[PDB]
Amino acid sequence: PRPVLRSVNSREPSQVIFCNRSPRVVLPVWLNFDGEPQPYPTLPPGTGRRIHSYRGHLWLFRDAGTHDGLLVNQTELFVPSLNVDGQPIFANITLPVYTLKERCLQVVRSLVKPENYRRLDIVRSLYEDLEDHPNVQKDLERLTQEIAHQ
Amino acid sequence: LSPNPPKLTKQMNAIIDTVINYKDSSGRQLSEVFIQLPSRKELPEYYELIRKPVDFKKIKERIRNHKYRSLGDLEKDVMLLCHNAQTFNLEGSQIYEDSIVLQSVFKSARQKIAK
Amino acid sequence: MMYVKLISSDGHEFIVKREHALTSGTIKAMLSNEVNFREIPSHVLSKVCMYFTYKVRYTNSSTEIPEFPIAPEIALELLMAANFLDC
Amino acid sequence: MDVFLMIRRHKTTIFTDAKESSTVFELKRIVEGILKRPPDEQRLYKDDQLLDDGKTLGECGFTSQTARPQAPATVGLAFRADDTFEALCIEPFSSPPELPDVMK
Ligand SMILES: Cc1ncsc1-c1ccc(CNC(=O)[C@@H]2C[C@@H](O)CN2C(=O)[C@@H](NC(=O)C2(F)CC2)C(C)(C)C)c(OCCOCC[NH+]2CCN(Cc3cn4c5cccc(Br)c5c(=O)nc4n3C)CC2)c1
């Protein structure tokens, strides 16, 4: 424990439905009791699974291959509440509306190797943007800051 | 020096091999997660709650070093493994659900092999 | 409805909604109706206008978000346009 | 049920949306508001086929799977000139360069 974004050791079971409604292979990521990310089995495009979690447990979803961030119920993070009368809680994993600059960045990353990012005819500014690959840790630093700032 | 006869150690590991090698309709080996307990560094919350931790590696070691003197003593620890899994993971969990079927696979195997 | 004209380097005029063209930060600055782009060609500027429609339609939307497609041949020029237009 | 289009004539391209139940005549009124040519001075096409004023966008073939925001359907436009109508001419966009070795 101690980081702001971490799962609470509640010991209160919560039944969640993970539904992948994106064209990406989804990687569910669970933040453990010390706020460290843990990978879980992947969900192919269009697949849905009934999974077992607990109250106050933090989740985030990424592209399994590229590590691009995804939305769950139109937002970054997912925390399941209590099962009201044994009803399952639904986690709808969708694709965010990426910025055209970030979406262009993804497509060129999938076609070019990391060693050949400097070989392109693009400006100096875009080499650093292209080398800044998306990861769970940087988006956590941005989120821990955002909710601590709020 | 050797407190258990050869036929007792033979039938003890015959029952545990049936529980370890058991597979459901899907073809998934239920025992997989129960073979190795996670370290205190990995899951410190497991040791805070469970007072007598046990896995299938320590159960096969306890058959090899002659700690259990009967089939009842072996069951004592296989049921403890399942109750620790149920107590820690709670109702609904796949680990909780896998523990219940592994308990019946041990009892039906003890009924089969012994008598 | 309020519209704006966006002209490419090769002379193609793209008439898009003002609210749609406001997606880009650079267009927001120069626009307060016409806007010229001497370094963005027509095939890139038409794809930027298709992003503005995709942006406004799926942002803060409960319908399923589809993938925005970018062909390998247009990916580089579209990246330079996106960086220059801030969208 | 919305349909996302590209109304094209010569080097002009209008980006607009319309309902699938909307008619071709109602789309000609949208072009009148933008380019100030009345519907009687217009001809709309899907490829080389002329579109009827009374037919809906869905009946012409423009549906949500074939006219998406990110990949809109093209609607050919030709204006009246003198007495007769001009030939449908859509000036194509410029071609992208050769795909580099780094991407190949
Ligand atoms: C199908 C699918 N598709 C997309 S995601 C998904 C999915 C989602 C969830 C689960 C299983 N559920 C969980 O792992 C939940 C989700 C999240 O909420 C955290 N979590 C937990 O269960 C945690 N548990 C909790 O918080 C509590 F139990 C309330 C305290 C979490 C992560 C476990 C700390 C899953 O399944 C598959 C196996 O995954 C299990 C992962 N390991 C097992 C070993 N265990 C380590 C481990 C080894 N062992 C033993 C070893 C030997 C003998 C025994 Br007797 C045990 C034993 O008894 N228990 C354990 N464990 C636990 C650590 C966790 C697949």
Short mmCIF file of C-alpha atoms and ligand atoms in Angstrom, two decimals:
data_model
loop_
_atom_site.label_atom_id
_atom_site.label_comp_id
_atom_site.label_asym_id
_atom_site.label_seq_id
_atom_site.Cartn_x
_atom_site.Cartn_y
_atom_site.Cartn_z
CA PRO A 1 0.00 0.00 0.00
CA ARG A 2 0.51 3.84 0.12
CA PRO A 3 0.04 4.99 -3.61
CA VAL A 4 -3.24 6.87 -4.30
CA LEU A 5 -4.23 4.49 -7.18
CA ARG A 6 -4.30 0.95 -5.73
CA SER A 7 -6.76 -1.90 -5.03
CA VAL A 8 -8.22 -2.04 -1.49
CA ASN A 9 -7.89 -5.46 0.27
CA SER A 10 -11.68 -5.40 0.88
CA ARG A 11 -12.30 -9.18 0.95
CA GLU A 12 -15.86 -8.48 -0.39
CA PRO A 13 -16.50 -10.47 -3.62
CA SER A 14 -17.87 -8.67 -6.72
CA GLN A 15 -18.92 -10.39 -9.98
CA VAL A 16 -17.95 -8.38 -13.09
CA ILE A 17 -18.64 -8.89 -16.81
CA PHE A 18 -15.65 -7.85 -18.98
CA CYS A 19 -16.96 -7.09 -22.49
CA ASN A 20 -14.47 -6.17 -25.23
CA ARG A 21 -16.33 -3.85 -27.67
CA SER A 22 -13.17 -2.65 -29.51
CA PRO A 23 -11.31 -4.05 -32.57
CA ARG A 24 -8.13 -4.55 -30.41
CA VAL A 25 -6.97 -7.62 -28.44
CA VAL A 26 -7.58 -6.34 -24.90
CA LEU A 27 -5.27 -6.84 -21.92
CA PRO A 28 -7.06 -6.43 -18.55
CA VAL A 29 -4.61 -4.88 -16.02
CA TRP A 30 -5.26 -5.18 -12.24
CA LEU A 31 -3.46 -2.73 -9.89
CA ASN A 32 -2.43 -4.85 -6.86
CA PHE A 33 -2.56 -3.78 -3.13
CA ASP A 34 0.74 -1.82 -3.63
CA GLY A 35 -0.52 -0.09 -6.84
CA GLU A 36 1.67 -2.28 -9.13
CA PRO A 37 0.03 -3.40 -12.46
CA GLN A 38 -0.67 -7.16 -12.97
CA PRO A 39 -1.57 -8.63 -16.41
CA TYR A 40 -4.63 -10.92 -16.75
CA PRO A 41 -5.76 -13.24 -19.62
CA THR A 42 -6.45 -11.34 -22.87
CA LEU A 43 -9.91 -10.80 -24.43
CA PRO A 44 -10.19 -11.14 -28.27
CA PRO A 45 -12.27 -8.50 -30.19
CA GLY A 46 -16.01 -8.88 -29.41
CA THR A 47 -15.44 -11.42 -26.57
CA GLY A 48 -17.17 -11.17 -23.20
CA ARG A 49 -16.35 -13.07 -19.97
CA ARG A 50 -17.86 -13.26 -16.46
CA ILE A 51 -14.90 -12.69 -14.11
CA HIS A 52 -14.63 -12.61 -10.32
CA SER A 53 -13.16 -9.54 -8.59
CA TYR A 54 -13.76 -7.69 -5.25
CA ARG A 55 -15.07 -4.29 -4.12
CA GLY A 56 -12.58 -1.40 -4.36
CA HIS A 57 -10.29 -3.22 -6.84
CA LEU A 58 -8.78 -0.94 -9.57
CA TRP A 59 -8.72 -2.02 -13.22
CA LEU A 60 -7.51 -0.54 -16.52
CA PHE A 61 -7.55 -1.99 -20.05
CA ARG A 62 -4.86 -1.76 -22.78
CA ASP A 63 -4.13 -3.14 -26.27
CA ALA A 64 -2.28 -6.44 -25.53
CA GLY A 65 0.28 -5.93 -28.33
CA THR A 66 0.69 -2.12 -28.54
CA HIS A 67 -0.12 -1.09 -24.89
CA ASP A 68 -2.44 1.75 -26.17
CA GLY A 69 -4.88 2.93 -23.47
CA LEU A 70 -8.58 1.98 -23.71
CA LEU A 71 -11.79 3.18 -22.01
CA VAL A 72 -14.02 1.17 -19.67
CA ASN A 73 -17.54 2.66 -19.30
CA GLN A 74 -16.38 5.87 -21.11
CA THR A 75 -13.47 6.42 -18.64
CA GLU A 76 -9.84 5.45 -17.82
CA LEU A 77 -10.35 3.30 -14.66
CA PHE A 78 -12.90 0.73 -13.43
CA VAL A 79 -13.69 -0.06 -9.76
CA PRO A 80 -16.55 -2.55 -9.13
CA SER A 81 -19.17 -1.62 -6.51
CA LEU A 82 -21.31 -4.07 -4.43
CA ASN A 83 -23.56 -6.67 -6.15
CA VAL A 84 -27.08 -5.31 -5.53
CA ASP A 85 -29.17 -8.52 -5.02
CA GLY A 86 -26.51 -10.74 -6.69
CA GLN A 87 -26.61 -8.74 -9.97
CA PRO A 88 -23.30 -8.70 -11.98
CA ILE A 89 -21.54 -5.35 -12.63
CA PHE A 90 -20.78 -4.62 -16.33
CA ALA A 91 -17.36 -3.36 -17.59
CA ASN A 92 -17.77 -2.22 -21.26
CA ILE A 93 -14.28 -1.94 -22.80
CA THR A 94 -14.32 0.41 -25.81
CA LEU A 95 -11.85 2.27 -27.98
CA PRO A 96 -11.28 5.98 -27.02
CA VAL A 97 -11.55 8.81 -29.56
CA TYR A 98 -7.77 9.17 -30.01
CA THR A 99 -6.30 12.47 -31.21
CA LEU A 100 -5.45 12.37 -34.95
CA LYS A 101 -1.77 12.99 -33.96
CA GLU A 102 -1.81 10.02 -31.50
CA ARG A 103 -3.71 7.74 -33.96
CA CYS A 104 -1.20 8.64 -36.78
CA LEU A 105 1.61 7.82 -34.26
CA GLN A 106 0.11 4.29 -33.66
CA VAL A 107 -0.20 3.35 -37.36
CA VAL A 108 3.39 4.41 -38.18
CA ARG A 109 4.62 2.47 -35.01
CA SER A 110 2.89 -0.71 -36.33
CA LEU A 111 4.52 -0.36 -39.83
CA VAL A 112 8.06 0.84 -38.82
CA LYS A 113 10.60 -0.79 -36.41
CA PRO A 114 11.79 1.26 -33.32
CA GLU A 115 15.38 1.40 -34.71
CA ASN A 116 14.10 3.13 -37.95
CA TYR A 117 12.06 5.96 -36.26
CA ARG A 118 14.97 8.41 -36.89
CA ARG A 119 15.21 7.38 -40.62
CA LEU A 120 11.84 9.13 -41.49
CA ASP A 121 11.50 12.55 -43.23
CA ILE A 122 9.39 13.97 -40.26
CA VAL A 123 10.55 16.94 -38.03
CA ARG A 124 12.75 16.60 -34.86
CA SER A 125 9.70 17.04 -32.54
CA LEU A 126 7.95 13.96 -33.99
CA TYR A 127 10.92 11.57 -33.35
CA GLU A 128 10.59 12.03 -29.53
CA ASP A 129 6.74 11.74 -29.80
CA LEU A 130 7.15 8.47 -31.77
CA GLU A 131 9.71 7.08 -29.23
CA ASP A 132 7.29 7.98 -26.35
CA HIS A 133 5.45 4.59 -26.50
CA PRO A 134 2.20 4.31 -24.46
CA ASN A 135 2.52 2.45 -21.14
CA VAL A 136 0.49 1.79 -17.97
CA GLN A 137 3.09 3.43 -15.67
CA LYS A 138 3.04 6.90 -17.37
CA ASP A 139 -0.79 7.02 -17.52
CA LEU A 140 -0.80 6.03 -13.82
CA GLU A 141 1.65 8.94 -13.03
CA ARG A 142 -0.76 11.25 -14.96
CA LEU A 143 -3.86 9.86 -13.15
CA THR A 144 -2.29 9.76 -9.59
CA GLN A 145 -1.35 13.44 -10.23
CA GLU A 146 -4.81 14.38 -11.65
CA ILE A 147 -6.94 12.95 -8.74
CA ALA A 148 -4.31 14.17 -6.12
CA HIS A 149 -4.40 17.66 -7.77
CA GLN A 150 -8.26 17.49 -7.55
CA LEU B 1 13.39 -45.14 11.16
CA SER B 2 10.71 -45.84 8.48
CA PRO B 3 7.33 -45.46 10.28
CA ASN B 4 5.17 -46.18 7.15
CA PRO B 5 4.94 -49.48 5.15
CA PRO B 6 5.62 -49.44 1.35
CA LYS B 7 1.95 -50.13 0.43
CA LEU B 8 0.79 -47.10 2.57
CA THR B 9 3.21 -44.67 0.80
CA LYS B 10 2.20 -46.33 -2.56
CA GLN B 11 -1.57 -45.75 -2.05
CA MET B 12 -0.96 -42.21 -0.57
CA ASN B 13 0.78 -40.80 -3.69
CA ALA B 14 -1.69 -42.80 -5.92
CA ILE B 15 -4.58 -40.69 -4.48
CA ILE B 16 -2.67 -37.32 -4.70
CA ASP B 17 -1.62 -38.09 -8.35
CA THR B 18 -5.37 -38.58 -9.19
CA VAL B 19 -6.15 -35.14 -7.63
CA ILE B 20 -3.10 -33.45 -9.32
CA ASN B 21 -3.68 -35.03 -12.79
CA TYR B 22 -7.52 -34.43 -12.69
CA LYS B 23 -9.00 -32.42 -15.62
CA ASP B 24 -12.57 -31.08 -16.08
CA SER B 25 -14.82 -31.23 -19.23
CA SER B 26 -12.92 -28.17 -20.62
CA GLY B 27 -9.57 -30.03 -20.30
CA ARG B 28 -8.16 -27.59 -17.69
CA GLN B 29 -6.02 -29.09 -14.87
CA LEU B 30 -7.71 -27.78 -11.67
CA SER B 31 -4.66 -28.40 -9.38
CA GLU B 32 -2.32 -26.12 -11.51
CA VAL B 33 -2.72 -23.00 -9.27
CA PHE B 34 -2.60 -25.10 -6.04
CA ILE B 35 0.81 -26.79 -6.73
CA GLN B 36 3.05 -23.82 -5.72
CA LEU B 37 2.10 -21.36 -2.91
CA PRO B 38 3.13 -17.69 -3.67
CA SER B 39 6.02 -16.21 -1.64
CA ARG B 40 5.58 -13.71 1.26
CA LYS B 41 7.03 -10.96 -1.05
CA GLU B 42 4.42 -11.72 -3.80
CA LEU B 43 1.29 -12.09 -1.62
CA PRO B 44 1.94 -10.89 2.00
CA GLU B 45 -1.88 -10.65 2.52
CA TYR B 46 -2.08 -14.51 2.21
CA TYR B 47 0.22 -15.07 5.23
CA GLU B 48 -1.53 -12.39 7.35
CA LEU B 49 -4.84 -14.34 7.05
CA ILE B 50 -3.77 -18.03 6.69
CA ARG B 51 -2.05 -19.52 9.81
CA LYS B 52 -1.01 -22.94 8.31
CA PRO B 53 -0.23 -22.41 4.57
CA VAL B 54 -0.04 -25.59 2.43
CA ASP B 55 0.27 -26.53 -1.30
CA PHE B 56 0.51 -29.83 -3.28
CA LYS B 57 4.37 -29.49 -3.30
CA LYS B 58 4.49 -29.64 0.57
CA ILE B 59 1.88 -32.50 0.56
CA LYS B 60 4.05 -34.65 -1.80
CA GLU B 61 7.10 -33.71 0.39
CA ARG B 62 5.15 -34.82 3.53
CA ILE B 63 4.42 -38.22 1.83
CA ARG B 64 8.15 -38.50 0.83
CA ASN B 65 9.43 -37.62 4.38
CA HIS B 66 6.77 -39.86 6.15
CA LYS B 67 4.99 -37.08 8.19
CA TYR B 68 1.42 -38.40 7.63
CA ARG B 69 1.06 -41.80 9.38
CA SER B 70 -2.37 -42.66 7.80
CA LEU B 71 -4.82 -41.70 4.99
CA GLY B 72 -6.79 -39.62 7.53
CA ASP B 73 -3.63 -37.53 8.22
CA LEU B 74 -3.21 -37.00 4.41
CA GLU B 75 -6.91 -35.88 4.11
CA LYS B 76 -6.36 -33.49 7.13
CA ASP B 77 -3.86 -31.49 4.94
CA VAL B 78 -5.71 -31.83 1.55
CA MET B 79 -8.89 -30.46 3.24
CA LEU B 80 -6.75 -27.71 4.94
CA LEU B 81 -5.38 -26.72 1.48
CA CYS B 82 -8.98 -26.43 0.19
CA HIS B 83 -10.27 -24.57 3.32
CA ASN B 84 -7.31 -22.10 3.13
CA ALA B 85 -8.17 -21.49 -0.58
CA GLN B 86 -11.87 -21.02 0.26
CA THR B 87 -11.17 -18.79 3.32
CA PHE B 88 -8.69 -16.58 1.39
CA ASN B 89 -10.44 -16.33 -2.03
CA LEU B 90 -14.08 -16.52 -0.71
CA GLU B 91 -17.33 -17.64 -2.43
CA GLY B 92 -17.68 -17.13 -6.20
CA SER B 93 -13.90 -17.27 -7.00
CA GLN B 94 -12.63 -19.84 -9.54
CA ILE B 95 -10.02 -20.93 -6.88
CA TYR B 96 -12.91 -21.44 -4.37
CA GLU B 97 -14.93 -23.41 -7.01
CA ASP B 98 -11.86 -25.52 -8.01
CA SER B 99 -11.21 -26.39 -4.31
CA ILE B 100 -14.71 -27.95 -3.87
CA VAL B 101 -14.34 -30.28 -6.91
CA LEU B 102 -10.74 -31.20 -5.83
CA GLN B 103 -12.17 -32.17 -2.34
CA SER B 104 -14.66 -34.66 -3.93
CA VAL B 105 -11.95 -35.98 -6.34
CA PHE B 106 -9.80 -36.81 -3.23
CA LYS B 107 -12.68 -38.59 -1.39
CA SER B 108 -13.87 -40.57 -4.45
CA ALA B 109 -10.19 -41.53 -5.14
CA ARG B 110 -9.68 -42.60 -1.47
CA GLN B 111 -12.88 -44.76 -1.70
CA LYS B 112 -11.61 -46.28 -5.01
CA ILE B 113 -7.91 -46.99 -4.22
CA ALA B 114 -8.30 -48.11 -0.54
CA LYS B 115 -11.56 -50.13 -0.84
CA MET C 1 -25.66 25.93 -39.98
CA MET C 2 -22.24 27.71 -39.91
CA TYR C 3 -19.65 26.44 -42.48
CA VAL C 4 -15.95 27.16 -43.25
CA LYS C 5 -13.84 26.56 -46.39
CA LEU C 6 -10.45 24.80 -46.06
CA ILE C 7 -8.22 25.04 -49.20
CA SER C 8 -5.37 22.52 -49.84
CA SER C 9 -1.98 23.16 -51.55
CA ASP C 10 -3.33 21.81 -54.92
CA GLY C 11 -6.53 23.97 -54.79
CA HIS C 12 -9.21 21.54 -53.49
CA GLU C 13 -11.81 23.41 -51.37
CA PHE C 14 -13.30 21.45 -48.41
CA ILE C 15 -16.51 22.92 -46.93
CA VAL C 16 -16.88 21.59 -43.32
CA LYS C 17 -19.01 22.78 -40.36
CA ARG C 18 -17.42 25.53 -38.20
CA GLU C 19 -17.95 23.37 -35.05
CA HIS C 20 -16.18 20.43 -36.84
CA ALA C 21 -13.18 22.52 -38.06
CA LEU C 22 -12.86 23.97 -34.48
CA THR C 23 -11.51 20.47 -33.45
CA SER C 24 -8.04 21.69 -34.60
CA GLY C 25 -6.20 24.17 -32.33
CA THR C 26 -4.39 25.88 -35.24
CA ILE C 27 -7.73 26.48 -37.09
CA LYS C 28 -9.16 27.95 -33.80
CA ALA C 29 -6.32 30.55 -33.73
CA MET C 30 -6.44 31.85 -37.37
CA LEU C 31 -10.27 31.50 -37.59
CA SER C 32 -11.27 34.52 -35.37
CA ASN C 33 -14.34 32.01 -43.04
CA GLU C 34 -11.58 30.82 -45.51
CA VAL C 35 -8.31 29.08 -44.41
CA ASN C 36 -5.41 28.21 -46.82
CA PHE C 37 -2.86 25.35 -46.41
CA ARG C 38 0.12 25.63 -48.81
CA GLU C 39 1.89 22.50 -47.35
CA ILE C 40 -1.15 20.11 -46.91
CA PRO C 41 -2.29 18.39 -50.16
CA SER C 42 -5.93 17.44 -50.99
CA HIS C 43 -5.73 13.68 -50.17
CA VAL C 44 -4.34 14.54 -46.67
CA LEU C 45 -6.77 17.47 -46.05
CA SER C 46 -9.80 15.29 -47.05
CA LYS C 47 -8.62 12.69 -44.46
CA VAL C 48 -8.27 15.49 -41.80
CA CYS C 49 -11.91 16.54 -42.56
CA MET C 50 -12.97 12.84 -42.13
CA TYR C 51 -11.30 12.91 -38.68
CA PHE C 52 -13.28 16.07 -37.71
CA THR C 53 -16.56 14.21 -38.50
CA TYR C 54 -15.30 11.12 -36.57
CA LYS C 55 -14.20 13.40 -33.62
CA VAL C 56 -17.57 15.21 -33.23
CA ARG C 57 -19.69 12.07 -33.84
CA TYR C 58 -17.98 9.70 -31.32
CA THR C 59 -16.66 12.09 -28.56
CA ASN C 60 -18.78 11.72 -25.35
CA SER C 61 -20.91 9.09 -27.17
CA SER C 62 -22.45 5.84 -25.81
CA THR C 63 -22.53 4.11 -29.27
CA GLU C 64 -19.59 1.73 -30.05
CA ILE C 65 -16.44 3.61 -31.22
CA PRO C 66 -15.10 2.08 -34.50
CA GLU C 67 -11.41 2.27 -35.51
CA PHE C 68 -10.30 5.40 -37.45
CA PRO C 69 -8.48 3.82 -40.47
CA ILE C 70 -5.21 5.24 -41.87
CA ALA C 71 -3.67 3.54 -44.95
CA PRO C 72 0.16 2.97 -44.82
CA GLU C 73 0.80 5.36 -47.80
CA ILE C 74 -0.94 8.40 -46.13
CA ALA C 75 0.30 7.76 -42.50
CA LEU C 76 3.41 10.03 -42.71
CA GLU C 77 1.87 13.11 -44.42
CA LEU C 78 -1.23 12.77 -42.15
CA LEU C 79 1.05 12.69 -39.04
CA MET C 80 2.78 15.96 -40.14
CA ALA C 81 -0.66 17.57 -40.82
CA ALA C 82 -2.05 16.42 -37.40
CA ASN C 83 1.02 17.83 -35.57
CA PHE C 84 0.78 21.14 -37.51
CA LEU C 85 -3.03 21.42 -36.91
CA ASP C 86 -3.07 20.20 -33.21
CA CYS C 87 -5.93 17.62 -33.40
CA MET D 1 -29.89 6.61 -38.33
CA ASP D 2 -27.25 9.07 -39.66
CA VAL D 3 -25.40 8.87 -43.00
CA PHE D 4 -22.05 10.76 -43.52
CA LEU D 5 -21.41 12.08 -47.05
CA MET D 6 -18.96 13.92 -49.33
CA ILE D 7 -20.86 16.00 -51.96
CA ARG D 8 -18.30 16.55 -54.77
CA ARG D 9 -18.17 18.77 -57.91
CA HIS D 10 -14.95 19.72 -59.81
CA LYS D 11 -12.50 20.81 -56.97
CA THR D 12 -15.29 21.40 -54.33
CA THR D 13 -16.12 18.86 -51.56
CA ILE D 14 -18.92 19.46 -49.01
CA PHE D 15 -18.76 17.35 -45.83
CA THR D 16 -22.26 16.85 -44.40
CA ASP D 17 -24.48 14.39 -42.55
CA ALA D 18 -28.11 13.45 -43.24
CA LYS D 19 -30.63 10.87 -42.01
CA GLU D 20 -31.04 7.54 -43.85
CA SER D 21 -34.82 8.35 -44.23
CA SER D 22 -33.99 11.85 -45.70
CA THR D 23 -34.69 12.32 -49.45
CA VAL D 24 -32.40 13.31 -52.34
CA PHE D 25 -34.50 16.53 -52.69
CA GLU D 26 -33.85 17.41 -48.99
CA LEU D 27 -30.09 16.88 -49.71
CA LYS D 28 -30.39 19.29 -52.69
CA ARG D 29 -31.84 21.92 -50.23
CA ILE D 30 -28.70 21.45 -48.02
CA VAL D 31 -26.53 22.15 -51.15
CA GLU D 32 -28.72 25.25 -51.90
CA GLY D 33 -27.98 26.65 -48.42
CA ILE D 34 -24.20 26.17 -48.94
CA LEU D 35 -23.52 26.79 -52.70
CA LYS D 36 -26.69 28.91 -53.41
CA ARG D 37 -27.93 26.87 -56.45
CA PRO D 38 -31.63 25.81 -56.24
CA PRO D 39 -32.59 22.07 -56.42
CA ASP D 40 -33.91 22.47 -60.03
CA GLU D 41 -30.34 23.56 -61.05
CA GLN D 42 -28.80 20.32 -59.58
CA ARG D 43 -28.19 16.65 -60.40
CA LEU D 44 -26.92 14.23 -57.70
CA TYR D 45 -25.25 10.85 -58.47
CA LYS D 46 -23.99 7.69 -56.70
CA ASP D 47 -21.10 6.64 -59.01
CA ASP D 48 -22.58 7.24 -62.56
CA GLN D 49 -26.30 6.63 -61.61
CA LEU D 50 -28.59 9.72 -61.32
CA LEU D 51 -30.50 9.94 -58.00
CA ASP D 52 -34.31 10.51 -57.94
CA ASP D 53 -35.63 13.49 -55.89
CA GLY D 54 -38.31 11.33 -54.18
CA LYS D 55 -36.02 8.40 -53.20
CA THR D 56 -34.51 8.31 -49.68
CA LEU D 57 -30.76 8.14 -48.93
CA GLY D 58 -31.20 4.50 -47.82
CA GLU D 59 -33.07 3.61 -51.06
CA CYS D 60 -30.15 5.12 -53.09
CA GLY D 61 -27.71 2.84 -51.19
CA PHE D 62 -26.25 5.24 -48.57
CA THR D 63 -26.47 3.28 -45.25
CA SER D 64 -24.60 3.50 -41.90
CA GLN D 65 -22.24 0.60 -42.87
CA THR D 66 -21.45 2.20 -46.32
CA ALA D 67 -21.34 5.94 -45.28
CA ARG D 68 -19.47 6.23 -41.95
CA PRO D 69 -18.01 9.45 -40.36
CA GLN D 70 -14.43 8.13 -40.82
CA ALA D 71 -15.15 6.73 -44.38
CA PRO D 72 -18.03 8.75 -45.94
CA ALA D 73 -19.81 7.93 -49.23
CA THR D 74 -19.22 10.19 -52.26
CA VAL D 75 -22.20 11.96 -53.86
CA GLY D 76 -21.51 13.27 -57.37
CA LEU D 77 -22.90 16.76 -58.10
CA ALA D 78 -23.45 18.53 -61.48
CA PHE D 79 -24.98 22.05 -61.86
CA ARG D 80 -27.24 23.52 -64.59
CA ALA D 81 -25.44 25.81 -67.05
CA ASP D 82 -27.25 28.11 -69.65
CA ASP D 83 -30.09 25.63 -70.53
CA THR D 84 -28.60 22.07 -70.56
CA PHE D 85 -26.71 20.45 -67.63
CA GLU D 86 -22.93 20.04 -67.38
CA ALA D 87 -21.28 16.58 -67.43
CA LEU D 88 -20.48 15.02 -64.02
CA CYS D 89 -16.80 15.86 -63.35
CA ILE D 90 -15.14 15.11 -59.97
CA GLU D 91 -11.47 16.23 -59.98
CA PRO D 92 -9.53 13.46 -58.15
CA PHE D 93 -7.39 14.14 -55.07
CA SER D 94 -3.59 14.08 -55.40
CA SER D 95 -1.73 10.76 -55.12
CA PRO D 96 0.43 9.89 -52.06
CA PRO D 97 4.19 9.30 -52.68
CA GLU D 98 5.85 5.85 -53.00
CA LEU D 99 5.76 3.86 -49.72
CA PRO D 100 9.35 4.12 -48.25
CA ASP D 101 11.68 1.10 -47.68
CA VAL D 102 11.36 1.64 -43.87
CA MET D 103 7.56 0.92 -44.15
CA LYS D 104 7.82 -1.63 -47.07
C1 LIG E 1 -10.94 -15.06 -17.89
C2 LIG E 1 -10.43 -13.66 -17.87
N1 LIG E 1 -10.43 -12.95 -19.05
C3 LIG E 1 -9.97 -11.75 -18.86
S1 LIG E 1 -9.53 -11.36 -17.24
C4 LIG E 1 -9.98 -12.96 -16.77
C5 LIG E 1 -9.82 -13.37 -15.36
C6 LIG E 1 -10.20 -12.52 -14.33
C7 LIG E 1 -10.07 -12.91 -13.01
C8 LIG E 1 -9.52 -14.15 -12.67
C9 LIG E 1 -9.38 -14.59 -11.23
N2 LIG E 1 -9.64 -13.53 -10.27
C10 LIG E 1 -8.68 -12.82 -9.68
O1 LIG E 1 -7.49 -13.09 -9.77
C11 LIG E 1 -9.15 -11.60 -8.89
C12 LIG E 1 -9.26 -10.38 -9.82
C13 LIG E 1 -8.82 -9.19 -8.97
O2 LIG E 1 -9.91 -8.68 -8.20
C14 LIG E 1 -7.76 -9.78 -8.05
N3 LIG E 1 -8.24 -11.15 -7.82
C15 LIG E 1 -7.95 -12.01 -6.82
O3 LIG E 1 -8.45 -13.12 -6.77
C16 LIG E 1 -7.07 -11.53 -5.65
N4 LIG E 1 -7.68 -12.06 -4.44
C17 LIG E 1 -8.13 -11.34 -3.40
O4 LIG E 1 -8.16 -10.12 -3.37
C18 LIG E 1 -8.67 -12.11 -2.18
F1 LIG E 1 -8.58 -13.51 -2.34
C19 LIG E 1 -9.82 -11.66 -1.38
C20 LIG E 1 -8.44 -11.64 -0.80
C21 LIG E 1 -5.57 -11.94 -5.77
C22 LIG E 1 -4.98 -11.50 -7.10
C23 LIG E 1 -5.40 -13.45 -5.64
C24 LIG E 1 -4.78 -11.27 -4.64
C25 LIG E 1 -9.12 -14.99 -13.72
O5 LIG E 1 -8.60 -16.21 -13.34
C26 LIG E 1 -7.62 -16.85 -14.19
C27 LIG E 1 -6.45 -17.17 -13.35
O6 LIG E 1 -5.96 -15.96 -12.78
C28 LIG E 1 -5.58 -16.08 -11.42
C29 LIG E 1 -4.43 -15.15 -11.15
N5 LIG E 1 -3.52 -15.50 -9.99
C30 LIG E 1 -3.70 -16.90 -9.47
C31 LIG E 1 -2.66 -17.17 -8.42
N6 LIG E 1 -2.77 -16.23 -7.31
C32 LIG E 1 -1.82 -16.56 -6.26
C33 LIG E 1 -2.37 -17.64 -5.37
C34 LIG E 1 -1.81 -18.87 -5.23
N7 LIG E 1 -2.58 -19.57 -4.32
C35 LIG E 1 -2.42 -20.87 -3.80
C36 LIG E 1 -1.36 -21.69 -4.17
C37 LIG E 1 -1.24 -22.95 -3.62
C38 LIG E 1 -2.20 -23.43 -2.73
C39 LIG E 1 -3.25 -22.61 -2.35
BR1 LIG E 1 -4.48 -23.34 -1.10
C40 LIG E 1 -3.40 -21.31 -2.88
C41 LIG E 1 -4.52 -20.42 -2.51
O7 LIG E 1 -5.39 -20.76 -1.71
N8 LIG E 1 -4.56 -19.15 -3.07
C42 LIG E 1 -3.64 -18.80 -3.92
N9 LIG E 1 -3.52 -17.61 -4.59
C43 LIG E 1 -4.45 -16.50 -4.42
C44 LIG E 1 -2.56 -14.87 -7.83
C45 LIG E 1 -3.61 -14.51 -8.87
C46 LIG E 1 -9.28 -14.61 -15.05
#
